[PDB]
Amino acid sequence: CKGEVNFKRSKFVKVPSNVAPSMLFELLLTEWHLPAPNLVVSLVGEERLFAMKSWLRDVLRKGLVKAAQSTGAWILTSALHVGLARHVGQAVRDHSLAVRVVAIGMASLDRILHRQLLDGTPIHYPADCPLDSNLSHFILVAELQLSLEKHISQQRSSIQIPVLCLLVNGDPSTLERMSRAVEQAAPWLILGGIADVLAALVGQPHLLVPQVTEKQFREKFPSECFSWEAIVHWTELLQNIAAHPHLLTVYDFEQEGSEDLDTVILKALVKACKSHSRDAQDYLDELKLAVAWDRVDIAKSEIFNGDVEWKSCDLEEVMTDALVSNKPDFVRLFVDSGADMAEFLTYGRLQQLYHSVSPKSLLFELLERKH
Numbered sequence: 001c002k003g004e005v006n007f008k009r010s011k012f013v014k015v016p017s018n019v020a021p022s023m024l025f026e027l028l029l030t031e032w033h034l035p036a037p038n039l040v041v042s043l044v045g046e047e048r049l050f051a052m053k054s055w056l057r058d059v060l061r062k063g064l065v066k067a068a069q070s071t072g073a074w075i076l077t078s079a080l081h082v083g084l085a086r087h088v089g090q091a092v093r094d095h096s097l098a099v100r101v102v103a104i105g106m107a108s109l110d111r112i113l114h115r116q117l118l119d120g121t122p123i124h125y126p127a128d129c130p131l132d133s134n135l136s137h138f139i140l141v142a143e144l145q146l147s148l149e150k151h152i153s154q155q156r157s158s159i160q161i162p163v164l165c166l167l168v169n170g171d172p173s174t175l176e177r178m179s180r181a182v183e184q185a186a187p188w189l190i191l192g193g194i195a196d197v198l199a200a201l202v203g204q205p206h207l208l209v210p211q212v213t214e215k216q217f218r219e220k221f222p223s224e225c226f227s228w229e230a231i232v233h234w235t236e237l238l239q240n241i242a243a244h245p246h247l248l249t250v251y252d253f254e255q256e257g258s259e260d261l262d263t264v265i266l267k268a269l270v271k272a273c274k275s276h277s278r279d280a281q282d283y284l285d286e287l288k289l290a291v292a293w294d295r296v297d298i299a300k301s302e303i304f305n306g307d308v309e310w311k312s313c314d315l316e317e318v319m320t321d322a323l324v325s326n327k328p329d330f331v332r333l334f335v336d337s338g339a340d341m342a343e344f345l346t347y348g349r350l351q352q353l354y355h356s357v358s359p360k361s362l363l364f365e366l367l368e369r370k371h
């Protein structure tokens with residue numbers, strides 16, 4: 001079901017559970033006419049008591065600023081998540097006001113207030129719970145999000161589209177869902193909340209945590225004391241999760257020696273794709289993203305370390321992209337990677353390059369007037 005909220009209208013798509021993810025994908029793209037996804041970053045952690053220090057908030061702000069600058073992506077921030085997420089919605093709205101990034105409010109309907117008012121045309125839902133009015137879209141209804149992620153990581157010049165999850169100041173309730181994410185072939189990045197526990201407990205000489213989990217749950221958020229059976233279940237859960245480390249990665253941005261947000265993103269992405277397979281056609285999308293960030297160090301060190309083998313045949317599209325974007329370092333790297341200009345350059349390709357002249361340029365006006 002399609003609906004609009006004249007609040008500047010926000011879209012509502014009825015989300016019946018166990019629906020086809022491809023159906024929702026097609027509905028979103030068609031009805032919303034939004035650009036193709038170059039990246040899909042989904043949030044998994046949000047809490048009202050969750051507070052962000054100035055450093056982590058700034059590196060989150062600078063990161064989203066750089067993301068909206070060149071690449072643009074989709075931030076699957078669940079609506080009706082009142083807390084720190086509303087500030088994120090206001091911030092992304094202000095930064096987009098200042099290629100573009102989009103945010104989707106994939107959220108249920110039970111926790112929303114005035115749900116009967118919107119169920120049965122500006123639906124006024126003024127509640128002092130209601131959803132954050134900073135977002136301009138929503139999907140009205142964890143398994144749905146996981147299946148949507150598994151679907152997006154399967155949609156496919158044969159290019160893929162990356163998908164990543166970013167958790168921030170999570171609660172011990174997402175852990176179960178998090179386990180499914182380990183089986184969903186999706187990379188995960190950890191920094192605030194239970195994230196500190198998951199980080200300090202991911203690398204240990206002892207695989208199982210029969211007693212350290214209790215000490216962690218006691219030292220961290222000691223307001224709620226859970227049952228011992230729950231702690232044993234969650235210890236087994238964390239064991240089964242950390243059984244697969246090559247998809248999970250943690251980094252500390254407060255150490256003052258941290259690399260930029262965009263860097264670790266691509267680092268974890270290539271780390272995941274390396275364990276996924278070694279197909280040259282695989283790393284393409286992420287590689288394109290690297291060009292979008294002008295990141296050459298990680299391009300040469302990680303991608304072109306000699307592990308994967310490159311053939312002159314596949315580099316054509318990415319080389320053209322690097323050329324039109326005016327980034328000579330990557331051109332040098334590619335031509336040193338075996339790509340030969342002698343056979344790549346054709347008169348049709350050369351005309352294409354001329355067809356790629358920017359309209360506001362002077363050469364464009366000169367050629368147009370001459371024509």
Ligand SMILES: [Ca+2]
Nearest residue numbers: 160282283284
């Ligand atoms: Ca890939």
